[PDB]
């Protein structure tokens, strides 16, 4: 029922790059999803205490959220685009795992994922 430490956003010994694909992931992908009317439940790690989800972290062992991804992109945490794309996919997958089909939160994730897929389709060449 307690919250775990949040995912890492800082790791000085992790090698880093700033690439045109990672720039696109921030300037286009993250910004598009962040501004959406359904963004709010995904803009920070799941607070299992505030949201009264005492089993959330029993079930979800690889937590991820756009607050974390936003910090990772702004602080150049990544080496490549695939790492960041995996974070988004983890976020959506977690939501579908924990929740019931048709739940509001699932519909919200689906709308963000649709946009995500549209933006990744046009990921610029390296």
Swiss-Prot record:
Residues covered by the Bromo domain: 17-123
Domain of life: Eukaryota
Modification after translation (UniProt): Phosphorylation by CK2 disrupt the intramolecular binding between the bromo domain 2 and the NPS region and promotes binding between the NPS and the BID regions, leading to activate the protein and promote binding to acetylated histones. In absence of phosphorylation, BRD4 does not localize to p53/TP53 target gene promoters, phosphorylation promoting recruitment to p53/TP53 target promoters.
Site, as annotated: Acetylated histone binding: 99
Cystine bridges: none
Functional note: Chromatin reader protein that recognizes and binds acetylated histones and plays a key role in transmission of epigenetic memory across cell divisions and transcription regulation. Remains associated with acetylated chromatin throughout the entire cell cycle and provides epigenetic memory for postmitotic G1 gene transcription by preserving acetylated chromatin status and maintaining high-order chromatin structure. During interphase, plays a key role in regulating the transcription of signal-inducible genes by associating with the P-TEFb complex and recruiting it to promoters.
Disease per UniProt entry: Cornelia de Lange syndrome 6: A form of Cornelia de Lange syndrome, a clinically heterogeneous developmental disorder associated with malformations affecting multiple systems. It is characterized by facial dysmorphisms, abnormal hands and feet, growth delay, cognitive retardation, hirsutism, gastroesophageal dysfunction and cardiac, ophthalmologic and genitourinary anomalies. CDLS6 inheritance is autosomal dominant.
Further remark: JQ1, a thieno-triazolo-1,4-diazepine derivative, and I-BET, a benzodiazepine derivative, have been tested on tumors with success. Treatment with GSK1210151A (I-BET151, a I-BET derivative) has strong effets on mixed lineage leukemia and promotes myeloid differentiation and leukemia stem-cell depletion.
Homology family: Belongs to the BET family.
Assembly and oligomerization: Interacts with p53/TP53; the interaction is direct. Interacts (via CTD region) with CDK9 and CCNT1, acting as an associated component of P-TEFb complex. Interacts with RELA (when acetylated at 'Lys-310'). Interacts (via NET domain) with NSD3, CHD4, BICRA and ATAD5. The interaction with BICRA bridges BRD4 to the GBAF complex. Interacts (via NET domain) with JMJD6 (via JmjC and N-terminal domains); the interaction is stronger in presence of ssRNA and recruits JMJD6 on distal enhancers. Interacts with NSD3. Interacts with NIPBL.
Protein name (database record): Bromodomain-containing protein 4
Source organism: Homo sapiens (Human)
Shown stretch of the complete protein: 44 to 167 of 1362
């Amino acid at each position: 029922s307690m919250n775990p430490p949040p995912p890492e956003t800082s790791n000085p010994n992790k090698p880093k790059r700033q690439t045109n694909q990672l720039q696109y992931l921030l300037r286009v992908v993250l910004k598009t999803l962040w501004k959406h009317q359904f963004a709010w439940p995904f803009q920070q790690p799941v607070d299992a205490v505030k949201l009264n989800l005492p089993d959330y972290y029993k079930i979800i062992k690889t937590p991820m959220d756009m607050g974390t991804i936003k910090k990772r992109l702004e602080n150049n945490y990544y080496w490549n685009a695939q790492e960041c794309i995996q974070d988004f996919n983890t976020m959506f997958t977690n939501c579908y795992i924990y929740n019931k089909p048709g739940d509001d939160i699932v519909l919200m994730a689906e709308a963000l994922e649709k946009l995500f897929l549209q933006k990744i389709n046009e990921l610029p060449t390296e």
